[PDB]
Amino acid sequence: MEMEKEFEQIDKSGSWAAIYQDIRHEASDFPSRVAKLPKNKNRNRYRDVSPFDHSRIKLHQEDNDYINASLIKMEEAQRSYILTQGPLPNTVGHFWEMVWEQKSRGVVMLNRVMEKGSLKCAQYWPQKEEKEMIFEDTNLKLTLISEDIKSYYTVRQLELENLTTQETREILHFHYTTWPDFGVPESPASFLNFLFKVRESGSLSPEHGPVVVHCSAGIGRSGTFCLADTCLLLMDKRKDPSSVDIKKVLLEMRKFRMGLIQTADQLRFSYLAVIEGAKFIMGDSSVQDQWKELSHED
């Protein structure tokens, strides 16, 4: 495997920071004019994280269509993702409006609400079955139907109802609860077990709208998740691990949203996760059971 030789060269020479700096230097810069309009200042969580105009998601709303969210369209892989920031208290209605309008089936949350003593995301889903949430600004009702709590992640089944039309949809919420901000998962096994649970749910299927992926900013942990999933899909289509250039894929994804992957360690972890996941792609389905056991999910 050529990425496995690349990994060893970089690791033994301690070069991860230099490689990551090269990526930052080569990454695309496109206008983000809409994000910076004064009327949108309170729709952005971080001043330095903005969607590009060309790939931003537009709300179907005539007053103000802005949400801090980007469509990542991986044409070669035939998979799309919506990456967004953790919603703010005033944007939780916009968040669910986007989910509705884009026909998403799953939401992947890679952060906790409180991290490092600060609030990184609003509580945007209900905590109890009998206490539904109503978003008066966007006319949606959200109900918790069930939750399956594991040791390091939680899966929730939510019902989203459009109060204008009375039509309902089931949304799956996949919540990774042990991935630190600016950090990496505990092991490739834990990460891959979680990714494959998302895959197996059908949420990434082309018959649904794009999956919504977020962390606090929608770039660091979110980018790591999407990079690994896309690389494994590209390897699967070709059945050729040596045709996937992880750095080129990341640069392609950065055409659609700035800043994807925020540390050299997250880049290094992306390699490890793709190298380990390749074992399943190339025909050893038993590794998936090993990942579940090493993840201590139960």
Binding-site residue positions: 181, 215-221, 262
- Examine the residue annotation and report whether 226 is marked as an active-site residue of this protein: no
Residue 56 or 112: the one with the smaller Cβ distance to ligand OTA is 112
Number of helices followed by number of strands (H, E) in the chain: 8, 11
Q: How far is the CB of 14 from ligand OTA (least distance, A)?
A: 24
Residue 18: strand, helix, or coil: helix
Q: How many CA atoms lie within 13 A of 116 on its CB side?
A: 9
Q: How far is the CB of 180 from ligand OTA (least distance, A)?
A: 9
Gap between the Cα atoms of 257 and 184, Å rounded: 20
Beta strands per DSSP E along the chain: 56-58, 66-74, 79-84, 106-109, 114-115, 118-119, 133-135, 140-149, 153-162, 168-176, 211-214
Binding site feature residues for substrate:
181, 215-221, 262
Residue 275: strand, helix, or coil: helix
Residue 134 C-alpha from the chain's centroid: 25
Residue 211 or 281: the one with the smaller Cβ distance to ligand OTA is 211
Residue 44 or 143: the one with the smaller Cβ distance to ligand OTA is 44
Q: How far is the CB of 251 from ligand OTA (least distance, A)?
A: 18
Q: How far is the CB of 54 from ligand OTA (least distance, A)?
A: 21
Gap between the Cα atoms of 228 and 284, Å rounded: 18
Gap between the Cα atoms of 212 and 222, Å rounded: 10
Q: Which residues bind ligand OTA (CB under 6 A)?
A: 46, 48-49, 111, 120, 181, 215-217, 219-221, 262
Residue 102 or 216: the one with the smaller Cβ distance to ligand OTA is 216
| Catalytic residue (choose from 121, 215, 226, 231) | 215
Catalytic residue list: 215
